[PDB]
Amino acid sequence: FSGDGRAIWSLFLYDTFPKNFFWGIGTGALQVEGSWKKDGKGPSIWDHFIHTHLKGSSDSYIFLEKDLSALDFIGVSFYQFSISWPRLFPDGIVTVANAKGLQYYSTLLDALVLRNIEPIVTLYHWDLPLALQEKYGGWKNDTIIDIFNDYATYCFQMFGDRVKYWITIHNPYLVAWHGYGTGMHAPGEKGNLAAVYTVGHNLIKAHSKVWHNYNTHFRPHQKGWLSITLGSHWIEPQRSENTMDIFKCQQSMVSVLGWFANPIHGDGDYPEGMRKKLFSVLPIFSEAEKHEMRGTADFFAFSFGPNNFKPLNTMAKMGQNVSLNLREALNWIKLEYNNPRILIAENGWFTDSRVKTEDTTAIYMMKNFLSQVLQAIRLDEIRVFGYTAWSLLDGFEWQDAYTIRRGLFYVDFNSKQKERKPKSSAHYYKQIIRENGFSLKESTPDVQGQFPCDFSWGVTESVLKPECTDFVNIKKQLEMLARMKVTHYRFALDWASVLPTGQLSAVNRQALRYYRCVVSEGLKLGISAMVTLYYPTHAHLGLPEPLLHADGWLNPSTAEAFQAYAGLCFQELGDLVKLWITINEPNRLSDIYNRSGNDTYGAAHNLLVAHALAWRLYDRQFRPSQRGAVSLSLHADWAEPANPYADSHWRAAERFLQFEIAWFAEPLFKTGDYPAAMREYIASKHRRGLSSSALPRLTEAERRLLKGTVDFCALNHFTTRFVMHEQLAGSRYDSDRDIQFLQDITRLSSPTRLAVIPWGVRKLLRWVRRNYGDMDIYITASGIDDQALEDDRLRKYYLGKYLQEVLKAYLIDKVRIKGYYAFKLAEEKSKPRFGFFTSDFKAKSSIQFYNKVISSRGFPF
């Protein structure tokens, strides 16, 4: 009931809508018809307003064929359009009807019924006949109430045969507020306070009279429904949970939506707040008018889109923060007006007018809106029976004219043909309707089967610094590993703790002893070690201070120091340790060398050399005796196109993988040199005056050194990126790959915005297999953070799903995948909650889940 909305302010895995959910799209007469003075159409206030306050449009009135084509392409069930009143009744009074306009609406209605599309017909979408503004004052004069009911009566009589869904007025809030409050809309009276509320009053009363008209005289033999489309915005409190911010939030909502909803969908009166705040500006319903307003809508038509949001004078925000959260808005309607049936009568956003058909953001705005509606239906039980995307085609967007576009279909207004081209959102909304929700198509069904008996089941941690069971450090770790059925453990050493000099002339032997103790205790648990020599983090670069101050990784001698460190660790641990990662994610170490674009490429060259020197040392001097294996970890998030209808975004997704994985993988795995794609792309944007960076060619000696220096392929995979082609300026590494990212705010994500996109790991493994062949692959890091400190449902979810796709890559795709290391074992207090154990070493639920998988070698039938 009134006021119940304030409550609003004080793992979702659904993709598809209710059976029989109802998909549509909308237009409004004035935006799309054109032909404003054609075949005896009377002028509207909006015709006068444009030719006074401003300076063919989509020309639907002559191209009905072309819009019926677009409707068929989308596959919508309903189409919502509006009858231009002055095209029927030039003087609004119902003297002789203009038979050519009646022919147009009749022809449209016939075509929709024969294509099985339900019409939703809107009587009044702001284009009041000019003659009623001049003779009467338009909605200021209450004689309009019967002038409007007469017009509806004819419309029911001429079309009710074929129309079962009727809207009286589209968004009466803007009619009153911008027509007479702000002057932004026809007729353009600014600051007229008394008009605003008299106009609103006449619109309410006219609607009610049309509802009762329809209820009595047409519903029995036509059996349709009538509502009114109430627009509104949404608002959230300035301060977190400020009790009076919340009260102002409620005031904002009432002032826009309650003003018209409370008479029609509520108790039959204006909102009590308004009645106080406006005790004598605001008209009064008699107690009998109160009983004939209550209930004059057969459903809640609701509009939520850019016109209730911009310009800033459209609503009173009352100091609290603006919001696009449609789910909460729908919830507000549910509590205020007691869970009615909702049709979303208008929803969408807008794109800049120089975007033609590649409307990438429009897709993600549509995805986000649709997701909120599905949450509303499923989580909150809100009776949303239908969705009207907005709008079918580009047209004249009221005071903005043609400076924004809102159509699912592009119209070049400078061409006579005015063809309707499907934008990317038209492709997207098409598939949405086909599948009745989110494309359930990139998600293959679960496999039953098992990993081979010799698969590595790992857990990873990062750098451990030194302090056998003497060492308290190692006890607490063993207590954690004892609760895991993992067979491998992956941990990093601290280069600066072993050789504080960075030279072998000063070895911390206590530090090696602590590391050895870590390996040897783990062998007692029956757990093998994979030791990472160098694991740079944001917080600690990891270099011994002398080589940091001597230019770090830009200094080629830093690569030799690393070889000295590698040999030491191979010598003092290699009898115990059979798996080695030289460097963890050197490809993402470019960002520390942010400055020159040639700076990040040089540091990466010395990083490749460090690895190849360490690896050759092992291969020559330590493998014969120790018979272990050595590689490095690459960060390897998957990439898909942001806009999948843009051939340019497909190419950007491959370029991303080139710059991310092939940068290191191509020389060290396959050819001893940088990948062609990368050298050749950096060629153009420097041969085309955009970047002063060169990717230096590598000496045939340099080629020889790096080629073939990996015993297996190691990948740290967490998420999938959605990438856009965008030509960037500058010469930084980021700049040369010409890539921007789009966060799909609608996917199951972690606190830190890691997307759960399981099938990305399967695509990655096959991309790796196909570029670098049937060499062995270990996933050396895989995880996600999670707010939950005992029941990490998101980690459990991620782990089950991604491991299921790894199984698919093994059983179905035949990728030589040998191991999975989960990320990570424990978490530090300031740091994102990535651990299987809390900072206090308490175990989370996912441990039992990970063990169960390990015990089963997968997901057996």
């Binding site: 807008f350 993600y364 960060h635 960037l728 980021d734 990212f741 705010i745 990535f834």
Partner: peptide, 24 residues
């Protein structure tokens, strides 16, 4: 939400961000 932008929710980034590994 920048109500006057065509990307009011700022979905289009251009910053990759560090991997889990660099946030420890």
């Amino acid at each position: 939400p920048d109500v006057g932008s065509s990307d009011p929710l700022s979905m289009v980034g251009g910053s990759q961000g560090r991997s889990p590994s660099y946030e420890s």
